[PDB]
């Protein structure tokens, strides 16, 4: 009965990227488990990544090196630009 999904989140992303484009339920589910699994890799690898240095608390640098080490290629630079941009925007207020 009780289930959780991103749903309207990803839908609003679609509204702010391609307003005239629609999405089906199978697409919302495959992208749901997609972002859930990508998060499973980021946080899953960040766990042992923070465990190497015996650091108890996880911080933004642990996730930084985590996802930066996760996906190779130039995409990581955009991840740093947008990610650190949102970090500075959040801490700025």
């Amino acid at each position: 009965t009780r289930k959780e999904s991103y749903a309207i989140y990803v839908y609003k992303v679609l509204k702010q990227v391609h307003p005239d484009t629609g999405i089906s339920s199978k697409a919302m589910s495959i992208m749901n488990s997609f972002v859930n699994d990508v998060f499973e890799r980021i946080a899953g690898e960040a766990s042992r990544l923070a465990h190497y240095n015996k650091r108890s608390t996880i911080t933004s640098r642990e996730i930084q090196t985590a996802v930066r080490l996760l996906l190779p290629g130039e995409l990581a630079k955009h991840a740093v630009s947008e990610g650190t941009k949102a970090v500075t925007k959040y801490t700025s207020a």
Binding site: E4, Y6, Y9, V10, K12, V13, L14, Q16, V17, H18, D20, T21, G22, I23, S24, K26, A27, I30, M31, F34, V35, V38, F39, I42, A43, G44, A46, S47, A50, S56, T57, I58, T59, S60, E62, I63, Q64, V67, L70, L71, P72, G73, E74, L75, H78, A79, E82, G83, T84, K85, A86, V87, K89, Y90, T91, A93
Partner: protein
């Protein structure tokens, strides 16, 4: 004491609180950070809008308003690094894009 979601302070979609508490109870680390779920929300914004944007371009190329997992596979494998990250993992209902070998076709 007006309640304002901190996810809206960064101007994002994916919530900081849900991924924050989910990361807490997810027994990944004994403690948690402050800006870490915000950075997670950010990379989810850029990746979700990334692959969703290529999917929108594929659906626009096929003259379809909605999107299809076929167009999802085409969008993934078309991009270089996006297919490089997803090359090991398979897909569901996506399929294989048409390809023809060099000498397989006759003269």
């Amino acid at each position: 004491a007006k309640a304002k979601t901190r996810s809206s302070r960064a101007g994002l979609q994916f919530p900081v609180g849900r991924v924050h508490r989910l990361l807490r109870k997810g027994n990944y680390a004994e403690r948690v950070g402050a800006g870490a779920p915000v950075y997670l929300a950010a990379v989810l914004e850029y990746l979700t809008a990334e692959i969703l944007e290529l999917a929108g371009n594929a659906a626009r190329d096929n003259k379809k308003t909605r999107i299809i997992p076929r167009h999802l596979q085409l969008a993934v494998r078309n991009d270089e690094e996006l297919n490089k990250l997803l090359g090991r993992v398979t897909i569901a209902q996506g399929g294989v894009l048409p390809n023809i070998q060099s000498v397989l076709l006759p003269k």
